[PDB]
Amino acid sequence: PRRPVIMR
Amino acid sequence: PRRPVIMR
Amino acid sequence: PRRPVIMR
Amino acid sequence: PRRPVIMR
Amino acid sequence: VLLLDVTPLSLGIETMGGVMTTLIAKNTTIPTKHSQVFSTAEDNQSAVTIHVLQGERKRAADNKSLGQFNLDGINPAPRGMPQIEVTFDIDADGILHVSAKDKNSGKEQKITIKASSGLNEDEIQKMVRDAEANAEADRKFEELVQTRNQGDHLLHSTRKQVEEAGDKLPADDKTAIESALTALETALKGEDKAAIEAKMQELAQVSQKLMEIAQQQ
Amino acid sequence: VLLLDVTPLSLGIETMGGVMTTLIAKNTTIPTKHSQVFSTAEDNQSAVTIHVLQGERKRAADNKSLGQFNLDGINPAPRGMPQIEVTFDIDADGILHVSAKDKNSGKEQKITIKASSGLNEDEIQKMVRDAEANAEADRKFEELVQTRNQGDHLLHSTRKQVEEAGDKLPADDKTAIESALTALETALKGEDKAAIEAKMQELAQVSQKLMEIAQQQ
Amino acid sequence: VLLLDVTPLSLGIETMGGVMTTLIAKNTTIPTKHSQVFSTAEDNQSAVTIHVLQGERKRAADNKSLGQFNLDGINPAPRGMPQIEVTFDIDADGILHVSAKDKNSGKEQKITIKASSGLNEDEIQKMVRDAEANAEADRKFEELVQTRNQGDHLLHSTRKQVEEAGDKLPADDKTAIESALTALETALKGEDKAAIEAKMQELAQVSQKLMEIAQQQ
Amino acid sequence: VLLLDVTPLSLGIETMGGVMTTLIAKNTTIPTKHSQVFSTAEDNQSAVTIHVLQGERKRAADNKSLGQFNLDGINPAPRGMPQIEVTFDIDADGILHVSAKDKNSGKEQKITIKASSGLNEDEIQKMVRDAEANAEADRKFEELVQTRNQGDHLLHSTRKQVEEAGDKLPADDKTAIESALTALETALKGEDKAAIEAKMQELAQVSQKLMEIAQQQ
């Protein structure tokens, strides 16, 4: 699955 | 005015 | 007593 | 010639 | 070379939240040029304040001010869309040029800062020592700022999504989400990291149906 | 104390773009617990991969893998809305617990990593030395990643805004924006930082009317 | 390993002049064992004081005392001849054993220092910061100490050489050298680095004939 | 100031044993002037070689040579008596002047080294990285050098004391000391730290009566 994105 | 935000 | 001296 | 020695 | 000209302290700007964002790292040889792209914090924002900082601290206010200027003429847009490119450029004479350009409007504004500005030899070491003394404090500040921006994004976003949903969102979801957004907004007003996460959690908990609707649209 | 137990290398996870994001800094005394909130990269994303890294390099791939696991059961949502809280927790025995919790769904998944995992004394120094050797390279990588995420956000956002605009956006704006988005998408496929900024610029240039409409709504 | 046990501060002993001489460097993994050989400062010296220090400062007095003990039974000898081997040994439990052995007499004395002695986490950072704050001050101190030991060696040596010369040295040389040695001895009593070098210079200037005689013998 | 001119690498000279002794520390702002007093390694020595080094390594041979020159005209003296003051002086233009002056004879010799000499930006970082890579190796080298100088001092000294003792020293002591000095001299010819300490120990063990006589005189 995708990697986590630093939340905005 | 506002400070710049690190663009998403 | 004296402190030790870095030996020559 | 010799190198200098850290003087005692 | 026996010698190198170097930045004794990081150089940067103030970003949302009162944090110093570094454009040029401590210990960079000059000449050097670095750039980063920033954006607006509010819908319809028409101007930004560029505040130039020297130092190693995480609060903007704990660093040396090198000057500030506004870029205006930013065209109406949703927050986070305009591209505001900030460039720091240090020439062979150690003069710093800080520019901000709006990629949409094409408008540019600049400050030029001579090589003798900023902190003297003693203060550079006072600064280095203090950044060390206050490392834990500074990290916690930066974590609080990051948390508050996250809460704010969730706040602003959820409001837009409630708007876009309109009738699709059931009364009881809407009422719960709106009270969670009030609670969140109250918490974003403080400096209590945990309270903010608590209110962001409450919002995640009551937004499930809203998130489905927004994803579907 | 004559002695301190310390993290010899930063510990973290892989984030979008293939970059190592630090949760626990190099040289932290244990026990320690740190957390950060992450989100999804795609609309409707139902799962995330948590990939645990030890090291100082900016590419994830250049650090030591300590293990990876998936959290799933993420409920349908717009990208960047779910709150995925990742906690790194090192106990007095130097065991690392890495957890990821979905604040909406309440789902949690975990990896536990013993105190003997990761890099030995020699490799910790190989790693330290390499992070130093490749500082410039690593920064440039990180700048490229940041630029590509920015381009992607602009891409994804502009598409949503074109959708939301519908008839409000004139034919000629729409055609220009859509060709700019194709060009951008092509560039996000490469590793050419300048090309990406060029295509983000083209988009800022042709989106003025779209930005007005999106701001007004 | 995710973790390393490390010396958070240098460990050492006080040496002549009031300076901290490091046996175990800051940031050493334990277990570790290091040794160095020291000697006596005076003819016929029968004992030495071993004073164990933790810290990064150059004055002994500015570091943390971990304890002190005497080794005695040193057999009559010219200064600088006995071999007094000091060993610092930190075991897997972080206990420090500091031993001093007289290689001639064979006599050994020891202090054992538990892993919880010395400076706590806060003070280790107060210490690190202070060593940084006072770098210039500490160097100057160390230079003054080095200069004073040099002057002292020249003093002590020249006196022995005057003795060994006896009649070979002319009256006028002897009188000039002896007044230079009084002046030097007066200066070794102060903290004025330049005055000491001045008096060492005066001695070099008036000792030429003495140096010939001592070299010839 | 936004900028500081700094030594990117330590500057120094080669001292006995093939070790780099630092006169100007890494990261010193210029202008700067530092001095240290050195001496001769042999009785009657009439000249010294000043070999200027840039770098962070402990073996002289692993640093950058900036040049070398001889000072001669040193007047006959016991080793360790002449005062040979070496000054490193870096002016506002980053030119290095290295001077050596004989305080007895008054003789001075100099090398002048332009600001563009030495290692370029890349090599300064190759050097920094290597000093890190080889820290343990370099320390061990420096310990071996220190041990060999100590052995040599003991060798040279004991020989002088045997001479000065003459008839006071009994046949059996003399024979034992002389064979210990041969063994020591053989060991000073190698790179085996332990063998040298072993032979220095044997000498301490058989010299007790000699040390009494030398102390008494």
Q: What DSSP string runs through G15-63?
A: ETTTEEEEEE-TT-BSSEEEEEEEE-SSTT---EEEEEEESS-SBGGGS
User: How many angstroms separate the CA atoms of G106 and F2, rounded?
Assistant: 29
Task: Kindly list the residues from chain H whose CB atom is less than 8 angstroms away from the CB atom of residue D3.
Answer: 13-18, 41, 48-49, 51
d(CA H55, CA H118): 9
Q: Write phi, then psi, for F70 (nearest 5 degrees).
A: -95, 145
The DSSP-derived string for H14-51 is EETTTEEEEEE-TT-BSSEEEEEEEE-SSTT---EEEE
Q: Give CA–CA dist G31/G36, Å, rounded.
A: 17
DSSP letter string over chain F? ---EEE-SS-EEEEETTTEEEEEE-TT-BSSEEEEEEEE-SSTT---EEEEEEESS-SBGGGSEEEEEEEE--PPS--TT-S-EEEEEEE-TT--EEEEEEETTT--EEEEEE-TT-S--HHHHHHHHHHHHHTHHHHHHHHHHHHHHHHHHHHHHHHHHHHHHHGGGS-HHHHHHHHHHHHHHHHHHTSS-HHHHHHHHHHHHHH-HHHHHHHHH-
| Whole-number Å distance between alpha carbons of G149 and G27 | 30
CB H72 within 8 A of CB D1: yes
Question: How far is E59 from E61, CA to CA, in rounded Å?
Answer: 5
Give the technique used to solve this structure: X-ray
Distance CA E84, CA E15 (A): 12
Rounded Cα distance, E96 and E113, in Å: 5
The torsion of the CA quartet F110, F115, F117, F122, rounded to 10 degrees, works out to 150
Number of CB atoms found within 10 A of residue H68's CB: 15
Indicate yes or no: CB of F205 within 8 angstroms of CB of E76: no
Q: Whose structure tokens read 């295509």? A: F199
DSSP chain E: ---EEE-SS-EEEEETTTEEEEEE-TT-BSSEEEEEEEE-SSTT---EEEEEEESS-SBGGGSEEEEEEEE--PPS--TT-S-EEEEEEE-TT--EEEEEEETTT--EEEEEE-TT-S--HHHHHHHHHHHHHTHHHHHHHHHHHHHHHHHHHHHHHHHHHHHHHGGGS-HHHHHHHHHHHHHHHHHHTSS-HHHHHHHHHHHHHH-HHHHHHHHH-
How far is the CA of E139 from the CAs of E144, F5, G47, G165, H213, in angstroms? 9, 21, 51, 70, 67
- Measured between beta carbons, the chain H residues lying within 8 angstroms of C4 are none
Q: Please state whether beta strands H64-71 and H48-54 pair in parallel, antiparallel, or not at all (unpaired).
A: antiparallel
Dihedral of alpha carbons F54, F57, F58, F59, sign: negative
- The size of chain H, in residues, is 217
Name residue, tokens 């070689």: H49
Euclidean distance between the first and the last CA atom of chain C, given in angstroms as a whole number: 20
Q: Beta strand H32-39 with H96-102: parallel, antiparallel or unpaired?
A: unpaired
**Token code pair at residue B4:** 């710049």
Yes or no, beta carbons of E48 and B4 under 8 Å apart: yes
Domain coordinates in residue numbering, chain H = 1-135, 136-217
Query: How far apart are the C-alpha atoms of F22 and G141, rounded to whole Å?
Result: 41
Q: Are F115 and G1 spatial neighbours (Cβ–Cβ below 8 Å)?
A: yes
**Look-up of token digits 């003399």:** H174
Identify whether E31 is preceded by a cis peptide bond (ω within 30 of 0).
yes
Structure token digits, residue G146: 């080095």
Instruction: Identify the bridge partners of residue F73 per DSSP, sorted by sequence position.
Output: none
Strand E4-6 with G32-39, pairing: unpaired
Stated resolution in angstroms: 2.0
Residues paired with residue F110 on neighbouring β-strands, in sequence order: F99
- Give the F window 102-141 contacts with G, CB below 8 Å: 113, 115-121, 124
Query: What are residue E37's DSSP bridge partners?
Result: E85
DSSP letter assigned to residue G104 = T
Rounded Cα distance, G197 and G205, in Å = 12
Q: How far apart are CA G37 and CA G83, in angstroms?
A: 6
CATH assignment of G136-217?
1.20.1270.10
Phi-psi region of F126 (alpha: psi -120 to 50; beta: other; left: phi over 0): alpha
In three-state secondary structure terms, H152 is: helix
Give the chain D residue nearest H42 (alpha carbons).
Answer: D2
Q: How many whole angstroms from its chain centre is CA G19?
A: 6
Conformational region of residue H77, where left means phi above 0, alpha means psi within -120 to 50, and beta covers everything else: beta
- Put simply, whether E1 touches H (Cβ < 8 Å) is yes
Binary contact (C4, G86; C-beta < 8 A): yes
Q: Are F184 and F135 in contact (CB under 8 A)?
A: no
Pairing of strands G11-15, G48-54: antiparallel
Query: Cα dihedral angle (E196, E197, E203, E209), rounded to 10 degrees?
Result: 160
Distance from CA of G78 to the nearest CA of D (A): 15
CA of D2 vs chain H CAs: smallest distance (Å) = 5
Q: Which residues of E touch A5 (CB under 8 A)?
A: none
Q: Which of H8, H118, H7 is nearest to H52 (CA)?
A: H118
Extract the tokens encoding E9: 């302290």
Buried-exposed string E38-62: b where 16+ CB fall within 10 A, e elsewhere: bbbbebebeebbbbbbbbbbbbbeb
Q: Which of G41, G49, G72 sits opposite C5 (nearest CB)?
A: G41
Decide: G181 and G204 in contact? Cβ < 8 Å: no
| Upper half-sphere CA count for residue E188 (Cβ side, 13 Å) | 18
Residue H96, Cα to own-chain centre: how many angstroms? 21
Q: What is the DSSP string of G120-171?
A: -HHHHHHHHHHHHHTHHHHHHHHHHHHHHHHHHHHHHHHHHHHHHHGGGS-H
Name H15's bridge partners: H19
Let me know if B5 is exposed, middle or buried by CB neighbors in 10 A (0-12, 13-18, 19+): buried
C-beta of residue H155 within 8 angstroms of C-beta of residue H184:
yes
Rounded to whole angstroms, the Cα distance separating H201 from H180 reads 9
CA–CA distance, E62 with F160 (Å, rounded to integer): 40
| Nearest-10 Cα torsion for F159, F163, F164, F169 | 100
The residues, ordered by sequence, that sit 6+ positions from E168 with a Cβ below 8 Å of its Cβ are E213
| Inter-residue contact E12 to B2 (CB < 8 Å) | no
Which of E 143-172 lie inside 8 A of B, CB atoms? Answer: 149
| Strand, coil or helix: G5 | strand
Query: Strands E96-102 and E108-113: what pairing?
Result: antiparallel
C-alpha distances in Å from residue H64, one per residue of E152, E210, H70, H120, H139: 56, 68, 18, 11, 19
Give the number of A-F residue pairs with CB atoms closer than 8 Å: 59
CB-based contacts of E172: which residues, under 8 Å, 6+ apart?
Answer: none
Q: Cβ–Cβ of D1/H48 closer than 8 Å?
A: yes
Going by C-alpha positions, the residue among H200, H10, H14 that lies closest to residue G35 is: H200
Amino acid occupying residue F144 = L
Q: How far is it, in rounded angstroms, from Cα G106 to Cα G113?
A: 23
Q: For the stretch E2-32, what's the b/e string if a residue is b when 16 or more beta carbons lie within 10 angstroms of its beta carbon?
A: bbbbbbbbbbbbbbbbbbbbbbbebbbebeb
Helix (H, G, I), strand (E, B) or coil at G180: helix
What DSSP designation does H116 have? T
Distance CA H176, CA E38 (A): 82
How many other CB atoms are there within 10 angstroms of residue H216's CB atom? 11
Residue type, H124: I
In sequence order, the β-bridge partners of residue C5 are G39
CATH fold, domain E1-135, is Substrate Binding Domain Of DNAk; Chain A, domain 1 (2.60.34)
Helix, coil or strand: residue H10: coil
Amino acid in position G122: D
Q: Is H113 helix (H, G, I), strand (E, B) or coil?
A: strand
Q: How many CA atoms lie within 13 A of G44 on its CB side?
A: 4
Q: How far apart are CA H203 and CA G113, in angstroms?
A: 32
Nearest-Cα distance to chain H for F129, in Å, is 6
DSSP class of residue B4 equals P
What is the rounded distance in angstroms from the CA atom of residue F5 to the CA atom of residue F94?
A: 9
Q: Does the fold of domain E136-217 match that of domain E1-135?
A: no
Question: Environment class of residue E206 by beta-carbon count within 10 Å: exposed (0-12), middle (13-18) or buried (19+)?
Answer: buried
DSSP state of G108: E
- Which tokens belong to H179? 């064979």
Backbone angles phi, psi at F69, to 5 degrees: -150, 155
Alpha-carbon distance of F154 to E178, in angstroms, equals 28
For residues H65 and H53, the answer to whether their CB atoms sit within 8 Å is: yes
With both helix axes pointing from N to C terminus, report the angle between G121-133 and E121-133 in degrees, rounded to the nearest 10. 170
- According to DSSP, the β-strands at H64-71 and E11-15 are unpaired
CB contact under 8 A, H129 and F125: no
Cis-peptide, bond into residue H31, ω within 30° of zero = yes
Q: Which two tokens stand for residue G199?
A: 């008096």
Return the SS3 of G76: coil
CA-wise closest residue to F66 among G185, G82, H66, G3 = G3
Residue among G194, D7, E2 nearest H97 (CA): E2
What would the 3-class secondary structure string for H153-191 be?
Answer: HHHHHHHHHHHHHHHHCCHHHHHHHHHHHHHHHHHHCCC
Report the Cα G172 to chain-centroid distance in Å: 36
DSSP assignment of E81-141 equals -S-EEEEEEE-TT--EEEEEEETTT--EEEEEE-TT-S--HHHHHHHHHHHHHTHHHHHHH
